Assembly symmetry: none
Homo-oligomer: 117 residues x 2
Amino acid sequence: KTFKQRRTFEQRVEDVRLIREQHPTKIPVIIERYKGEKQLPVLDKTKFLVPDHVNMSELIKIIRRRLQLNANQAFFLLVNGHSMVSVSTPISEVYESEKDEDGFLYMVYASQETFMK
Amino acid sequence: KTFKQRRTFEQRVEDVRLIREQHPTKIPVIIERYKGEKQLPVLDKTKFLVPDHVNMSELIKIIRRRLQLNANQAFFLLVNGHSMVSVSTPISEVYESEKDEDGFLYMVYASQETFMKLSV
């Protein structure tokens, strides 16, 4: 069950508001596994509060470690399930350009082997 | 020198207008080789008038065939150079959601080696 299937739009908006009140310097990011991915594991949490000054490289490192990926494991992080962004892009720029109507920034991860369709 | 680096913005808006006038059932798509690609050739055809009812998987199969690729060979089509879309997505929905300001829909094709250079 995806995040958008678990919480309604107005609940997700409310979530973003509470996160903004309590963590005004964080970007609220929803990170989920690509559907049908089997190599990489599901994560124990879905909402990541990302410091708003870092770039995409830092988010990738955060996800690599929470996935406990092996050193030689390659994967893809796709904004809104489709977009590849340069690792040097500041996360605040991705957020203002690609955030959902509900205020979260959504990303999905998938292994190289999954895309070797 | 891409399709944009050979034609001015006015020249491209006019092209799309004629295509909408003259080919009303077709989606105007510009398909180019990924910058720096070393495993796939350049096609002589870059402007594709795609039937507006087909999904992405059928456009993928058209370019694969032009490139003479076998079934076993990997091939990637990236909208605007950076978007992977579902194979099942109608190209008319890709067009409305991803079209350029000039009215063309731009894509680039890439090999396995190029695509793998993009993982992180």
